[PDB]
Amino acid sequence: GSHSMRYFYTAMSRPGRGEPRFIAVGYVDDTQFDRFDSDAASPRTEPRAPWIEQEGPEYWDRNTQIFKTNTQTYRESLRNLRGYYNQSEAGSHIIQRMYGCDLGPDGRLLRGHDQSAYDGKDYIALNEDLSSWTAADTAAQITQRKWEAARVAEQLRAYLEGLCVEWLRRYLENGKETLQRADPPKTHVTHHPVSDHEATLRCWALGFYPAEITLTWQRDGEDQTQDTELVETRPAGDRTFQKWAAVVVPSGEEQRYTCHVQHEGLPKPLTLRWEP
């Protein structure tokens, strides 16, 4: 199937409570595989998936060097942006960055990503051409000018088309027993009377991987989007995910409703009804 790698950086200032914290996490698809936290007792890149543990000392040293350097770089960036927005030294602020590559079913680069945010708002993003930038405001235009002068887009393109894809392919092979395994949802429908007049039908999907899933209720074959309570997909803690969708239906009309489940791990899409 299709796969992706992403790194997620958070840099957060905290005036009066030391220097800004820098944390980096790396993911392949929905699986975290490394972390770095400048607040750790002894900051170093740590493995978070079994298949990465086989990488040699040179790998871990290289990662840690990069993240230690980033810690300093992002502290300078926080100072810069505080200035770009005329902000005082009193408040806490956050820079976030997410970047990485997407691969198609063929294993080739589908597209690359590189986006930054300040205080939860989009700041600057690399365009899909991997050659130009989209700046959100006049502050981000300052960054854009600096990055154009320094050939940053060219640097990102080289990384995204090269090392990013090369290492993602390596991780996918080393972790093939898990990263390339889709676990189908275990499904069931529960029934919960709410009154004499209505009952809740809840369609469950449990233990699936990856997180991508489609869960929908239909009434007489008509989608019930507006009337469905669909909770956010949530992690079980064992790598897998959970989700449910609920509709409140008139008593006695339960059989007019069907739950439909789509997921990569299923031999075929599921159609469920309440089974009294």
């Binding site: 990662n63 993240f67 350097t69 980033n70 770089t73 600057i124 600096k146 990055w147």
Partner: peptide
């Protein structure tokens, strides 16, 4: 593996 030589904003 993460991006090297990252430039400041």
């Amino acid at each position: 593996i993460p991006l090297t030589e990252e430039a400041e904003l």
